[model samples]
Target: MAFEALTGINGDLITRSWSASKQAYLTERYHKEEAGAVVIFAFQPSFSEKDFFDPDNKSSFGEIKLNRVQFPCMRKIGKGDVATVNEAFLKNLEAIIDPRTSFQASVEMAVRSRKQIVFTGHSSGGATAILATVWYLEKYFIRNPNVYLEPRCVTFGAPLVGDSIFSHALGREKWSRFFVNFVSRFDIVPRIMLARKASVEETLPHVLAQLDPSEQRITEFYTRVMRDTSTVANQAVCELTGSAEAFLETLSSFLELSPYRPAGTFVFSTEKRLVAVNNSDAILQMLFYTSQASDEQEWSLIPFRSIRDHHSYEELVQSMGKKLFNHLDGENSIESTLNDLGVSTRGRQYVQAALEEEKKRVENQKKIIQVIEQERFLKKLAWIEDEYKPKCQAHKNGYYDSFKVSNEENDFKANVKRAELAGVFDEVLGLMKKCQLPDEFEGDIDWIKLATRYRRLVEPLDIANYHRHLKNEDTGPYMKRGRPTRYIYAQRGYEHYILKPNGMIAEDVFWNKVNGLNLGLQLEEIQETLKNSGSECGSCFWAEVEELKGKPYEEVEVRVKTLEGMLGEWITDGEVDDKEIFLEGSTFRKWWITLPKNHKSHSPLRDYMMD
Candidate 1:
């Protein structure tokens, strides 16, 4: 249904993609579809956004991250491999995107002018369109942090472009909704990555040599690029999957699968209706099953439908309906192998009874929602903040000391509750780590907020337990090995969704930006950050500093100087209201005393505190 409504605009774009000369050139271009209140940027492009802005508007706009590249994937990207992305896709994106000037302006104009931007393409060009769309969405935050504009991508017969981590971050960022891929049931290019490398290696020569039979330059360009792109993508598949290759051969024994999964919504064009699937795993199996030839083919020989289906998108758009069958891999053979691999099976997960098909996904998400919303663990966590911490503060020290020295029932119960809550959040994160939890588990601000709060509230207590029990005598300290897994990943979620204005992000906070600078050096930059901003970056920061104690003096001699500067800044900037920061037993006090002679009073705060 979502696909059906958009076909009017999408179909015209697909036809233009086939006929347009823009695909051949490295320069990017767009025509204003003013009637539709949209401007379309299409593929095989080195697009400049300058024309989109009128000459009068050439003056600089507000607060944009200039010199920032438009397509982030081209740079040192997230914890994912670009090896899975065809080298050609990167080349094409590098050609089109000019962040030195026009890229940010075009995105800014789209948001400012309120023109909905659409990125669309068919076949290999469609794959570039996919990259363009992701680039825009990923760049959205820096361009316009306050406003939200719907940027849409429609790709017909586009191949998968990224590996497993790439797919995971796509959904994790909720950028998945911005795309709708129109995949014909048998499009060879869409499944080319799934096809065995040897079969594709054999079949490509036959198909590519016959390419562009109708056009001169178009065919020649696609012939070289497509062959390279296809072959490269297939090679990635071979390396990632346990294909008939010597590399990673052990993995092939259980299942031979590609790490490249489709990002965003995928529509499978069929006779009765257009089946739409949103989940990545579901689309993956559908890609495998739908691209298969109904009639058997000899092993290592691909069906010709791979070529024929890739070209049928313009016609398929006209013949369509809306039927949502969330996952089509309910087939016993498919589901069993999927289960064996520990790949998540959902929605139409099983085909046991009439009641099983649609009911499972809804029910499963509800169960996930229940665990996320389970208030007792959260409430107990709250009690530690609201009641227990206050009661301990009343006990003349703090909750950290109170919880550490406990042999009594109340402190004993608090420890159990802390461990119990840790287990609860661990289960939630465990599900998340495996991609089993619903989006709502991470989507809502409150959950990350809760996680951040839990980190601040309990992590110090966690550090206290380690040091108090002399666990640090065995290992270094609680923060040395790591914070608890729940806290670490929770802090990661905080970093992932870094800019939530209402809890929004304009910057990476906490341990997220732990590159280029060590955590200690970065702490100096976190000044004024800790006071007004309620991020885990600030609170968890001190816990890491707490780990610096009892280390070799030469190891941390210079590191403590930065901590001294941070102390002066935090105190000077009102980042902390704590008066006893230089008190008898604080880690800061211990470290300050450990400072080299005469170095202590060199820092004004240290001098003043001693005076």
Candidate 2:
């Protein structure tokens, strides 16, 4: 339902059909002081010391500089050479943001600026934005008594951007929760925080969405790994608490309650087919190594030891049995796969035998259950024979001794009855305790080591180590400084691409015409407005985007956004303009990622149709 927009005594708040607008409205409603405040932040697109990994763009921020980020963020803490923010990446950020900051500083550069000091982005930018926001707040507000001055940040489709636990615990609320992540189902980023990778999905009912479309391949593989993790973790919780069924049932109920939550669950059905090309596959495999099999080349996950949220044996087995095997359609047998990987026959046989034993244990559980029933009957019969069956002498007055007992005597009798039942209950439970788990589960599961290995598989470098192992490998022009690298476990196989500056597209630029017959003749409203009025801007010369109503080009796909759904009353009251100036200038940022190869070099203006 559309609600009326909040109004103030002064400035006219600009309204556009943008998700960012919701955050703006939230800030306005929750923190009125922050309303209509001009935001000053930095954004750098390129560098010198930090080399972005991409080879195609040498002059700009490339991938080579980003290589320093190859390690997990937490690992870099003790490293002497590692800077919180990579110097190279910061330079690039400053360069791009310098002009914007400069103009704001310049009195002549007076512009109708309504910027919020919020930094946000999707994916990589999302990562950087979160780091920048946190450190910025921490540096200034750590000592400040004024909580109202808290800088607000909102990120979309954010990847796990730091050491998991530390980042998870940073803010008053979980730092990740501050990120209101609009994750796609099974999105790789959100799951990085999950431990016991095998059984996380099974145990944790809530499934997140995948923001990056290409991550499906990696998701498929990890899902296999995690299924086992979840199943085992589920078992561990039950085994540990003696209430597996109750826990699962409770969790299932919770899932049902979250019906309104986004649903995008998926199960992996195949073994990962990784063909190494230019060491990419090898690099990937090593980073994703498993520890379930010591000799066999299988993936295993361990929970963090020094920290919480690591994997365990329960997680390891469940990761394989339920997760990897659940979706299999009679392909290669896991046994054969293990054999091929050179697993010792002894260990392999033990695993298979253990699985068989568990199956038998489930079936025999019925027998145990029946035994308990018989025991209950016997105990009741015995109690009746020994206690209630006792004959009572009748007094001369005709009242039986049992009915004529004193209050103290009756209390004693009740206590004795209760003691009998307690004895029977203990006996039954004691017998059940004799039923032991298979010998395979005798030892403690080393969760921390497993998690460490898991982390290593996702990233080649250890950020927590003394020296930056991959520090020399970075070739990007600039690196993000002070900030830790993105979560290694969260690393997925997708590139987050952004529109180049003064690049092929101007964010705030669109045009359209509306024609209607009032009485007889036709009246038309033709309008053209810049989407964003200032900053480095460029419009697509190949195909111009139409005003936000519909398709801009036959080949180029355009997404339309409007306040129509969110502004029904505002339109009815005539308190706001229905015609949005969303297709022009720099503020007009839309995902044109699906642009065709041939149109890459062309301008969007040429392709747009004019009436």
Candidate 3:
């Protein structure tokens, strides 16, 4: 009945043959009239030579705009191939789409009447139906923003129509809620053009052979981008004459050929039942199916069992009704059934957990605000006392007293001074609040400027190498080899710095500009000088190639000698003294020969030289 009302039995069409299993119906116009409207775009079977392949028009395989603002789409569904096959299919559907009784007009009527609209189609007609629905909604929403419209599109065995970018754009506009696509688990049409080179070369030929002769040409045309190498090569040459452009074009084409992502929700009908697939990212994960048949199998020898279910509308209607379990199963418990409609007990629990966490966050915010207010009030008092008194005294007596403190202090006094400075700093910040400010000014400050000004008040230090070293240490061994050495070792040093208002560094941000700078020189020498030399040992790890047998030996010997030379320079140039280092020897040679026990198997040397 779901299919019947949408696809009516038009006695005028000869192809409207009824079967015992389900009545076959084909009509240009079929409507399910109720509080909501349902309009069908019936499938028209046409398998002519002229409609199969047209070589004159070549289209790019990515995003195409639909309704500029509302429906940015991929060109795959609505327009023709610009040649034959899909082009012919789209043209045929366009011809049958009556301007007065079209899907677009039906949508307009539904919106005006404040009724929901459902668009349904099967096979090639399904593709057109989706496009029409998107186009309709896109135009309607823009023209009549005040009108409320809720439209749903359901298509059975529809072919893929766009790339991931198209899906991404559609997903951004909440199209997933409105579209419920039904595809057979083994449906070849939806995945035909999505085949990668390996699959096309191996699986497609066998699949093509099983298809009826009349349908083969259209399928072949869709897959020409992957199957026909000569076509791609010639097209590449003509379109991309430059070397860089040609390389990029070929790479782009390679990626485009394998993946064709469809937007909206997909209802995959397996042999057992239906599974609903949601999310654009999740959609890509289920786009392809691995085949069991051997690629070596000939087309004639292969059975048609795999794709037979794809074209059967009866099987789909039955499957869809069950998947719409809540609506179809009359005796089912209301509570359990409601849970099944994408809001399971487990999902509800997750929502509840999130709500509880948000409540906790709100509670935490109140405590944080109170702390801020307490600190701000102290600063307000300090500004009225220390700052205002000093200014008033200066105005009256022409001068204010100044004090000098010792440059150096022991740990206890240093700690005490740090805590005192932190207290003073809190009041310093509160002064900003008491100062005259913009009427709309909230609690937003340029922290970067504050950090910069603070850095100038003390010795500015660069912490570049330490950040780079940390980054390198975190990278995996395989990835480390590919990373450029200049970026790994070079010191631009100074970036950004600040600790939280607390006097202690350990609890929050560990580094002020000074702490970051103090680590720089030591980390630089260790990373740039020692680790750079140690890195040469990597040559020994991949040294077993027959043709390159002596390559690593020569490379390692040169690196070790160069490292020794640099070590000698450090010792002789007074940059470092022999006694200052932990090594046992005064010379680089002695140090290399008698490495410190703790440094024997350090990572840089082990990774660079040993397996």
Candidate 4:
């Protein structure tokens, strides 16, 4: 559906009188003089710094707490339920007019006088005006079918107020013909609410249509890193709330289901001239075209430039004044209006060509992203297969590769490396979850098993601390003469080496396969079978549990503290010279670590070795 152009007496009223007053509303420079039969209700814009994180803006129709509070009616419309105007917008309107009595009384008086009740404002004020007009019609005029009151709403740079259901609802009303919305091309405020920055980032490359696409990349970087405050706010809200599933639920409920949708005729001003599209078409265009040039306007750039295009409705009116008049009053369709304005058919063809080129560029960019992600995934996979497994074997074999340590320094460093290795495995799993691998791409090593094994191995090591003396050590009974025999006991290593025959390995492997295939699903029985592949698991370690069982804490606290101080330099340094191990099976060999020279008697090995 084409938009009805604004021209004639009504056009003159909006352009000459209301537009001037609307400018005043932005800065509190308006006068309330009713020039003729149209009873004008002018309101100042209520936007503020606090609006960035305002609770009113955050509130949604789906909020269960507000169920008892009366919502402006959304009786019937399109495929689903409609949300009313923004809660903030409604509150602002209500602050100005008493919804219970003020609009009803004024509209009734207008009916008695046989005068047109006109609502006008700019930006957020304009949005409020449109919503107030709807509320008046629904609350008062609809109830009194016999009452005749002409209501007209003209708004400039008005953001979308309600959902698709509201659009269809307004279209059903006879009064909708009098509702008109003007949108400047570069205005980004209309697109910010309920729109995803990720989606914008994805479309930006296509819109720019460049081979190198550095500008688009830079924009994406800025958006992702929170250079754009609106995008930052949107991301923070959606992501910081909960898990991905919960984020999805919030998105579906607030945005996808019943978000603010466009209504009335939309007169969109392009860089060249005004092109009109109906409510439905405008919404469709909003979804597709709104992301174009987003990084350039509305506080993303300099403040002066932001207002020059987005809020410059007066300029748009001035530039397209003649064309708008001709289109509306002289019975010229949009095509004729374009032709008279010197918008060439050849120029349109060039635009179409440019759009196709952009689409191609976007496809190529997607391929590049996939390639980069795949490289990262493969690198992690290779590290796990070639580096981590052999280190586990070496730790079991007493020393790793050619490097041997006589003290606990080797063990601590090895533990840190293993922890880092496990982290790499996790990175691989995450990358694989994101990127699509070829269906036939199965390597020599089992990726899922490797990831699961490494992940489980680090669980105990992450929490393990070097315990100097046993908590249950004896002082009198077991101490023959006055010396302690049993001393060091690393708490975690004793019980950590044994891997229980659990179904976790099978589950990880099965899930990875299922996700990789993306075949949707399989039957319960076969799925169980798939999950039982690596059910049995095992490992090896050197910590002696038997000797340390009956020992008690003595002066071991001081020993550990002194030892840690000695090795503090090694601990603080990032780089370590450790040999890589590539052995196969667990060696299951026992090794002993030397303690501080003065504390050698507390080693717990002196009596065992002597006997």
Give the winner by lDDT: 1
Please give each candidate's TM-score.
Answer: 0.70, 0.24, 0.39, 0.41
What C-alpha lDDT values do all the predictions have?
0.52, 0.28, 0.37, 0.42
Q: For candidate 3, lDDT tens digit of each residue in 1-611?
A: 43223222121110211121111124443333342233333343322222222223243332232322234222111111111124433454456556755555655566677654555555544565566666555555423444245555666666655554455435434455567676665456665444434334434444444442235543453344224322332232333223366567566745443334566767655444444544333333333221122354523322343357555555555444444321211232333432333333533333233333334434544543455457553454344335433442343321111101112232233233334433543443343223211111111234233322222211100111122234434543322343322112111001211111122222122123213323324434434433323222212111111112223433443334334333443346332333322222212223343443344354134322221
Best by TM-score: 1
Indicate the worst ten consecutive residues by lDDT in candidate 2. 257-266
* Candidate 2 TM-score versus the reference: 0.24
User: Residue 580 lDDT in model 4?
Assistant: 18
TM-score-sorted candidate list, best first: 1, 4, 3, 2
**Clash total of candidate 2:** 114
lDDT of 1: 0.52
Q: Model 3 compared with the native: what TM-score?
A: 0.39
lDDT of 1 by residue, 1-611 (tens): 33445333344554444343234334443322332566666554322222111123322210111122233322112222232444445445555676664655666677677776777766556767777776666666434544346677777777676655556556655667678787876565665544434334333444544432234332333334334434434444344223466544554465444445577777777655455566565565455444332344521123444456655665675454233322332334444433332233331242122123224534755775676577875688878767786666666555655666655576877787778777877776675654444544564577777777776667766766666677756875455464566776676565545543233232433333333234344555544323322233444435546555656656654445445444543455333325434544445565667666666665556544452
Which ten-residue region of model 1 has the weakest summed lDDT?
Answer: 59-68
Ordering by lDDT? 1, 4, 3, 2
Report RMSD (Å) for each prediction in the order shown.
Answer: 9.9, 33.3, 23.5, 23.9
Candidate 2 lDDT over 505-542, as tens digits, reads 11121121111111112223111222221111111110
- Candidate 3's C-alpha runs over 4 A off are 1-25, 28-55, 60-107, 142-148, 195-259, 290-303, 319-611
